């Protein structure tokens, strides 16, 4: 729980507990007992909805797909949806197991195949690579139940990179890849239907659990433009001859006059 | 009054604050419980762990900022740079001393932050990865040169806007990072001691830049009654507890 308010009477001190210095890079220790005369207040309030396990462990939508010809394909990434991407980019390194719930409006018999990295995924339904001996696969009927499975921490590191300031190739290379694109791939999920009846919309709701967040970062103050890319200059119109202008898409609102709000 | 000595070098200051120790941890050596590679790492310990002072940048009026990637900036600085070019992996803490002093007639501020994994944005538009040459400028750093719609976009140029920290996250929230402010009214220097921050024990020091020291002129440089309109900023970076493993040929061209 949060600390209680301590009582404080009138104080005439020579060491001020309210004159600090912003330049030292340390935040203030100032409580309300320094500035005013407080009373005792029993504070039973908690921040148990603000820890990383409760802040991030909520089952956000990570990706949408649409079955075109009884087939969908989604590579596992938190990068297509901006609301979970902002919450992950609060931090630099995140180590989490993830449970994956599939919400499909298809009626019939579906198959998910978690293709691990390094092999060819099935390029269609009725493909031969759906018949696999070792690729973990999930058969389910979407009526009477949603499927759910935990993918553990598959990292090649102690944590996932939310941000990477590096490249996968040395200096002389030409197809260099900035960012977190080469550092980790969580496989992909290949969807197919063995029936035909219902709809085509497949939603993938992924919940991070057993989370360990490692370096805090500023929350993003601009809308995302691409994925794996951290850009924020939105190029809105490609056709018309205002093409090379770039919107900013930030959230800082303006007030008409300071000292009047 | 302050004094920081790492071998064959010494930093001295007069009007200095508390030293910032980044995330409460000192730079350490890689423990055997946290190591992955099998070979014995090297430990230079006196000729690499020393204060290398980079080139001075000029804080004029209209200067938007500078940034130096680490350990990219020390790639030609002494035997730390030679051990970086000759080894497959490496880890290092850093002690970053930033010096800018003008007068009691000058005004201004400098937020001096150390960003782990400063993945810079593209300068704008299409889905283009930023270049290797533009995020590895050496000890010369990168003058931030301000936002404009007329900025060059040829070949993965990095973002030039200091307000969005050139990755889209707002300045002023940059104080979540290990930082200090050089306010010329009160102090003139800023020492930040950073441990090795990575989710991996050692990595290639040329491909990956772990830290990125960023200096932004928060408040402009007023000269006051004095005809000096621009004051140099010098950045003195010392590796600390640097180790390297997997020796190999020099990774130059």
């Amino acid at each position: 729980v949060v600390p209680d308010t301590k009582p404080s009477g009138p104080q005439h001190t020579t060491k001020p507990s309210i004159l600090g210095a912003m330049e030292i890079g340390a935040s203030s220790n100032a409580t309300p007992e320094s500035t005013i005369e407080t009373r005792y207040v029993y504070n039973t309030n908690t921040n148990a909805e603000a820890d990383v396990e409760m802040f991030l462990g909520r089952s956000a939508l990570w990706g949408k797909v649409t079955l075109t010809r009884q087939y969908a394909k989604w590579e596992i990434n938190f990068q297509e949806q901006a609301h979970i991407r902002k919450k992950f980019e609060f931090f630099t390194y995140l180590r989490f197991d993830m449970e994956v719930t599939i919400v499909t409006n298809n009626k019939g018999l579906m198959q998910i195949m978690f293709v691990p990295p390094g092999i060819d995924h099935p390029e269609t339904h009725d493909d031969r690579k759906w018949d696999s001996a070792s690729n973990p696969s999930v058969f389910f009927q979407p009526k009477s139940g949603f499927p759910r499975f935990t993918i553990p921490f598959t990292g090649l590191a102690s944590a996932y990179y939310m941000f990477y300031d590096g490249y996968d190739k040395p200096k002389g290379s030409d197809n260099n890849e900035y960012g977190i694109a080469p550092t980790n791939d969580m496989g992909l999920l290949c969807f197919r239907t063995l029936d035909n009846s219902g709809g085509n919309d497949v939603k993938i709701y992924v919940k991070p659990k057993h989370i360990t967040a490692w370096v805090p970062r500023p929350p993003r103050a601009t809308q995302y433009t691409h994925k794996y890319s951290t850009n924020y200059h939105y190029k809105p119109n490609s056709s018309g001859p205002d093409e090379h202008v770039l919107k900013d898409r930030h959230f800082i609102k303006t007030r008409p006059l300071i000292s009047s709000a | 009054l302050k004094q920081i000595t790492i071998g064959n070098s010494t930093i001295t200051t007069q009007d200095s604050l508390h030293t910032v120790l980044a995330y409460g941890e000192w730079p350490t050596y890689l423990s055997d419980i946290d190591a992955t590679s099998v070979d014995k790492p090297t430990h230079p310990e006196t000729s690499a762990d020393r204060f290398y002072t980079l080139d001075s940048v000029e804080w004029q009026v209209g200067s938007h900022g500078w940034w130096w990637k680490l350990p990219d900036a020390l790639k030609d600085m002494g035997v730390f740079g030679q051990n970086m070019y000759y080894h497959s992996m490496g880890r290092s803490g850093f002690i970053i001393h930033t010096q800018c002093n003008a007068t009691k007639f000058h005004s201004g501020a400098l937020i001096v932050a150390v960003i782990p994994e400063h993945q810079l944005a593209y300068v704008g538009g299409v889905k283009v990865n930023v270049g290797y040459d533009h995020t590895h400028p050496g000890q010369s750093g990168h003058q931030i040169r301000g936002p404009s719609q007329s900025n060059d976009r040829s070949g993965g140029k990095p973002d030039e806007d200091p307000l969005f920290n050139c990755n889209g996250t707002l300045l002023g929230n940059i104080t979540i990072f290990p930082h200090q402010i050089i306010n010329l009214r009160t102090n003139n220097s800023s020492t930040i001691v950073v441990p090795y921050i990575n989710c991996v024990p050692m990595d290639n020091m040329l491909k990956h830049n772990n830290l990125s020291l960023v200096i932004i002129p928060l408040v402009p440089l007023r000269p006051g009654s004095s005809g000096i309109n621009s004051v140099p900023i010098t950045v003195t970076i010392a590796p600390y507890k640097s180790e390297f493993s997997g020796a190999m040929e020099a990774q130059r061209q």
Partner: peptide, 25 residues
Amino acid sequence: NINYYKDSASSGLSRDPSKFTQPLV
């Protein structure tokens, strides 16, 4: 508190400020 799947990853959600706000020496 039962683990119905006999795996550590299969469980539910699991459970100091001064490294920030005062990172001094």
